[PDB]
């Protein structure tokens, strides 16, 4: 299925993923596309923060879904 | 491990904690450092208010995690 990622620039890119894909796998694809290391990526979907270890299906992520890429704050 | 506590205005203190620490212990540490009584402390993590009985590990609060302190009055 194809999903969308709202990148840091306001641009939306498309990814080919499977519901069985992990959040880490999506972050690796986002790293290939946008150059942000996975440990500095936060992915938000429909108000939910996506956790490493989970699959897209765990979050009801479907075709045409849009994830939002957030640069991981410095803490504080 | 070190975690961060940030007020609503963005001011930040740092705490030395353990994953096994309860939210009660964290509020007691905040009271020791800043003098704010635990009954007046509300702590937010991942959009939720944290309950005193659970531990930082129970909420998946890790090192470098940021908690948000709200004055309860």
């Amino acid at each position: 299925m194809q999903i969308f990622v709202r990148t840091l620039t306001g641009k939306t890119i498309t990814l080919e993923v499977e519901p069985s894909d992990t959040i880490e796998n999506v972050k690796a694809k986002i790293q290939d596309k946008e150059g942000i290391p996975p440990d500095q990526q936060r992915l938000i979907f429909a108000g939910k923060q996506l956790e490493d270890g989970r699959t897209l299906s765990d979050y009801n992520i479907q075709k045409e879904s849009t994830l939002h890429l957030v640069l991981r704050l410095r803490g504080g | 491990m070190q975690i961060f506590v940030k007020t609503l205005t963005g001011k930040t203190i740092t705490l030395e904690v353990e994953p096994s620490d309860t939210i009660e212990n964290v509020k007691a540490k905040i009271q020791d450092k800043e003098g704010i009584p635990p009954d007046q402390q509300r702590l937010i993590f991942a959009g939720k208010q944290l309950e005193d009985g659970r531990t930082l590990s129970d909420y998946n609060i890790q090192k470098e995690s940021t908690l948000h302190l709200v004055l309860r009055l």
Binding site: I44, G47 | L8
Partner: peptide, 30 residues
């Protein structure tokens, strides 16, 4: 307190006490 609110930048569902997004620090829109 109110109900949770979606960040207008990343959609994260924030606590009603917070004035900025917990994830990206976008200020609350109301």
């Amino acid at each position: 307190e109110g109900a949770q609110w979606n960040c207008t930048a990343c959609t994260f569902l924030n606590h009603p006490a917070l004035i900025r997004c917990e994830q990206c620090e976008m200020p609350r829109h109301f």
